Design a binder for this molecule. Sequence first.
Ligand SMILES: [Mg+2]
Ligand SMILES: [Mg+2]
Ligand SMILES: [Mg+2]
Ligand SMILES: [Mg+2]
Ligand SMILES: [Mg+2]
Ligand SMILES: [Mg+2]
Ligand SMILES: [Mg+2]
Ligand SMILES: [Mg+2]
Ligand SMILES: [Mg+2]
Ligand SMILES: [Mg+2]
Ligand SMILES: [Mg+2]
Ligand SMILES: [Mg+2]
Lengths: 191, 171, 136, 197, 233
Amino acid sequence: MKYIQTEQQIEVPEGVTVSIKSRIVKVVGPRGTLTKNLKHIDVTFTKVNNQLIKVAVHNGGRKHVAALRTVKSLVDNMITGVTKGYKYKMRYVYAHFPINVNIVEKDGAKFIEVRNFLGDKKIRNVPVRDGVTIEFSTNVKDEIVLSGNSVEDVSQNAADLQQICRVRNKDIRKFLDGIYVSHKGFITEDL
Amino acid sequence: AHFKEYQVIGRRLPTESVPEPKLFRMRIFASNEVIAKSRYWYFLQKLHKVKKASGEIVSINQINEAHPTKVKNFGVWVRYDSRSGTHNMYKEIRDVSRVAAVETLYQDMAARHRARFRSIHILKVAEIEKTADVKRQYVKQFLTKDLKFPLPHRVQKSTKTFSYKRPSTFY
Amino acid sequence: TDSIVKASNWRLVEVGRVVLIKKGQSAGKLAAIVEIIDQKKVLIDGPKAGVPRQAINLGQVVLTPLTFALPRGARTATVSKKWAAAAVCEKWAASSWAKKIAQRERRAALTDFERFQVMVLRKQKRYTVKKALAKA
Amino acid sequence: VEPVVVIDGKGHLVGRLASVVAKQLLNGQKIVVVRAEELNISGEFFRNKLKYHDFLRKATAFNKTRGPFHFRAPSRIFYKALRGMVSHKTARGKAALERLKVFEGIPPPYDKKKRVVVPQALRVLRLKPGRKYTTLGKLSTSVGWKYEDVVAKLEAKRKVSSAEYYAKKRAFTKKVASANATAAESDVAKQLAALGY
Amino acid sequence: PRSKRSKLVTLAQTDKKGRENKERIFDEVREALDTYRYVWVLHLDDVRTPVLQEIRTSWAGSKLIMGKRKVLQKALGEKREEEYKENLYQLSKLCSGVTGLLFTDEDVNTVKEYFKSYVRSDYSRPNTKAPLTFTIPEGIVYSRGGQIPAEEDVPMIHSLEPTMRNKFEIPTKIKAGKITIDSPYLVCTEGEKLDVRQALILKQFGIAASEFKVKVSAYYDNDSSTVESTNIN
RNA sequence: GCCAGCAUCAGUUUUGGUGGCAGGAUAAAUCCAUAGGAAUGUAGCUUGCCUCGGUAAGUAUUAUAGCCUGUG
RNA sequence: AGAACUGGCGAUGCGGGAUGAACCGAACGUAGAGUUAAGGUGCCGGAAUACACGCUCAUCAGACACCACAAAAGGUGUUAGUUCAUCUAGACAGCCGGACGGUGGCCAUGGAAGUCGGAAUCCGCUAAGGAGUGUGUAACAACUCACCGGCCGAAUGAACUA
RNA sequence: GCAGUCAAGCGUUCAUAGCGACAUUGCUUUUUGAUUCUUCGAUGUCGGCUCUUCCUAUCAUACCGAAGCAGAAUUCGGUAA
RNA sequence: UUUGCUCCACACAAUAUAGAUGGAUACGAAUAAGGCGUCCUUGUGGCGUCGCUGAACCAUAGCAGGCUAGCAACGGUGCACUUGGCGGAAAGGCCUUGGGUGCUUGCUGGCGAAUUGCAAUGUCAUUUUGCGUGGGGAUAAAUCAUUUGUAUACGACUUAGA
Ligand SMILES: [Mg+2]
Ligand SMILES: [Mg+2]
Ligand SMILES: [Mg+2]
Ligand SMILES: [Mg+2]
Ligand SMILES: [Mg+2]
Ligand SMILES: [Mg+2]
Ligand SMILES: [Mg+2]
Ligand SMILES: [Mg+2]
Ligand SMILES: [Mg+2]
Ligand SMILES: [Mg+2]
Ligand SMILES: [Mg+2]
Ligand SMILES: [Mg+2]
């Protein structure tokens, strides 16, 4: 129908600042600083007061209107990351061969080394992305914690750590081995 | 074309045992009087047993708009022939004149349903007097209090085949 | 420590926006928006410039950065009274856009003898300008 | 009106530019096109790459050295469109094509000259916002051109030098404007203003 | 075809009730106020059908309406210039919850002292606080979950471990034949905000630490045309 | 003898400027007068309000803006 | 493989359909000027990168009669309509609570309690709740759905047409 | 292919004038894996040697998906010349 | 090889030539954004202004631009010399120093022009030499023939010898 005006609304909390010049967003908060390059959407941002941003599309179709809410969700995830953080927890299970997972520094680059997955002689190497921190949670057996400000980087690093050790040419109703995400939450889990 | 509106009043031929036959009037949207009288005889032959050589045209007049500068909302009832069958439709057009609304409807039917002039009947044109009697959302979204919108990405045509600075689409 | 969002400023088509007509019978003259018909078409009226009340495409005009208070759908005597009360012709004449328009048509109306005079005075001004430069 | 017209090819559409350059050449005007790696084609990168592969598939089957020749530079892709739009088998078309020069980047002596644009071939004026487009340097690199980093390094060097030149000329323009505005409100300035200058 | 969400497939026996049920409830409320002289506005918030089919059995003499709240307020005509009695707008604006209307005729202190008694036990009180702190031990978990005797219980079924872990965030394995969580994990504690997860865990471990008791807002006599307020919490 | 230029005309044709009339609802409009009305509700007044009068919702047919319809 | 009427080619150039006996326009002494037919006006190529309202994005789009062939059907691609419904007595989506009692209805079964099967399909209390829509257990449990209620506050759902 | 029961569209709004997609049963037993020594073959202007390309409608090799797929070995699909 | 060569100058004869006739007049990036000016802590900053086309900007008066006399300024500009830098993508060009010397329409005066006859491009910028005259300087190789065999149908290839 080509609606005349469509708007979404972003509520920004107290201790954080946002700076948007030409569809390039910078969020500065109590945990760091995140940035994003939104120069493929054709939207307009407007500051109402110092606590509300409003994003709008004028004379947009259906495919164009469907991107306002994804812009709002991306900027809200930036705000949520810089004020709470993202914490993913991964648990790894085995039947016979215990998996040894360690953090290494191969020419100063912070890899995860996985070895003895299903008795393999192969060493699997997965690089830590920039900004995500990996810890090994004591008092829980066979668990890893990934923490960061960027939900995209934290989730992508947990995803390729999941995908590096998959079962090949076997029966997956019988061979229950590998690493799985068990919880996605926040570093500051409340308040 | 650019249409006009005519009233056409016709009649049978007076004869023995039928003196003073009944007069019938129609409102035809057409671009000239020849097409106006042809459309009159088309509709009268479909509705009665009268031919063009059985009857005669009594009067042909052109109707102008009463208030040509006043933006009105029109509801138009039409029927048309598609490739499979024939259907009735209701549409809404916001414009200043009945002939203007009829022109926009003919363009809209050609653009949206590939219906030519020869397969469209205008059943009725009427003005919707009150708001909250407007069914179409594409018309309703212009009846809002204090309506404002911009025009982003202004494109200007030029001459001279060459420019000496990069253009700017600001507005 | 305040947030900063700049990103835009736009001229709006709305009731009361005055408008320069770029092509047609009434080219070069000002009118006002009195009603919005659709996304592409509006109803305009300018009584003082001498343009009739009519519907047009927005592609035949250009919006100016001038506006005044006007109710929706106001008739011609009303738009005349509000136009002269809000005094938009003087602000339009004080704009730098209209001065460039008048400068263009004044340069077009010149004769051969006035072109010769323009050349002589340009040389006389260039002398003192170039002498006042480089010894500042 | 100029003896040679130099066109900056950044941000133009390929066929809409080639049409107007072909007409200018046949009418008798000398054209130099620079920055041919920055041109655009409407449509997705994958679709344009598949079109180039359909072109790449055609060759003379009994001797591949006789066939259509597939040139990989962006300047040569532009030249192929232009040669399609003139009648190059005649002497008139040959002379028209010899009135033209196409380069990647801005080599000497054209880096000290003025570059123009063609507004009816510009992508921001012609394409609807939201449509996808392809960049010619990326398309030619994917099909086999091998000088995309050399040209980028040379273009960075040229941009540094022209930024110095512009800083100098902008300061000079500032002092000339200040010297001109102090000779206004003079009698000959008022006479010139009345005559319209 | 346009991209739209299609509804889920269910082919069952019940059908959806309409405005006729609301109209019948409104007519019943007006006729019940006309027939019974002791209309009491009560607030039965969190209650199981078993407990109500008991109070409806104890006061087997009066009438109880438990319809929609806005429909009941419309039947009592909560408009300031509308009524079916004299000045029932106070008793109409009193309703602010999952309201109930107990229309009686018998008493006016007995029907306000027995209620102060009926107060049986209930589930884990998902909105309020809980008292009995429970911590499951570091062994195989069982059905009563440290609320029965040693060998007088059944070990927990294998088909609930995925709900125990991926829907209550309790660390668990299987590792021999049963649930058998490795450490001892305390679910709830005394005098704290019991969460939805804690309340669902206490319900699945089948504990009953909160009490249900009726709360009567007001009671209006139609003979004197007057409503007395109460706070029988 | 060869090749041209200008003026005044005739025949054919193409492209501008301007004047006088006729018709139609003896254009329909705008504009002026007058009766009725409404809301995408102006003044006024009243309110959980009240950033110290900003806004919000309720009355009110022109008032400290206007509009619509009929008749002339 | 054969007939009927008319128009053509053969016997015929010219403008157009890129190209062609038969299609469209038009039939021909040698020239000049003007106007057109059919067909066209980004460039090849003479002539508007005219004006106006819409639709369409194709990982073999589509682009002009003869003539260089493809529907019903399927699409969670988009556009416009038609007929039914629901909705401030609060509709659709989401969160949360209820989801009861004769009764573990009757046969079959080593055991099957709504959920391996055959029969069946009732009654009460209800605001509503199936002699059960699925997951589940050896069988029970537990969860979900059908159906009602609280919170939030504006239009929403189905089938069909092109 | 023949015969019968259906039943969404239908006979451009009729169900049963008259169609009728998706289904569904019947009919074709040396009817309890039995007999059948059978290649019940087709082919008359082509066949063979030598040699080169192209198609994909994929046999093998590469990578994936499903299956009561324990392992091993297979089967059915997708991309791919 | 009857004075052959290099580099720089013209007496004279010429060559027009896909087509001179005031000037090809240098940021980069974005377009749902920028340019310019100003202010301060120096920013994704505050304030102001501009755009809606180069229809601009610079240049432009004098016999195709002559001969002279003054005023006012310390400017503009041509022409060779000169001091330095910079430029490698195809640099082959750009900036600058300091003196000579010409012009100046910034302003004011004095002479001259005709007959090309009422128009006829009415010839005005740019080039490579040639006949030897004019000034310094520079003194070579290749092929055939003879020979080799890392090569070979023949040519070609690869070696040796004043
Ligand atoms: Mg004449
Ligand atoms: Mg008149
Ligand atoms: Mg013959
Ligand atoms: Mg013939
Ligand atoms: Mg013929
Ligand atoms: Mg022909
Ligand atoms: Mg053809
Ligand atoms: Mg002729
Ligand atoms: Mg042309
Ligand atoms: Mg395949
Ligand atoms: Mg296997
Ligand atoms: Mg191969």
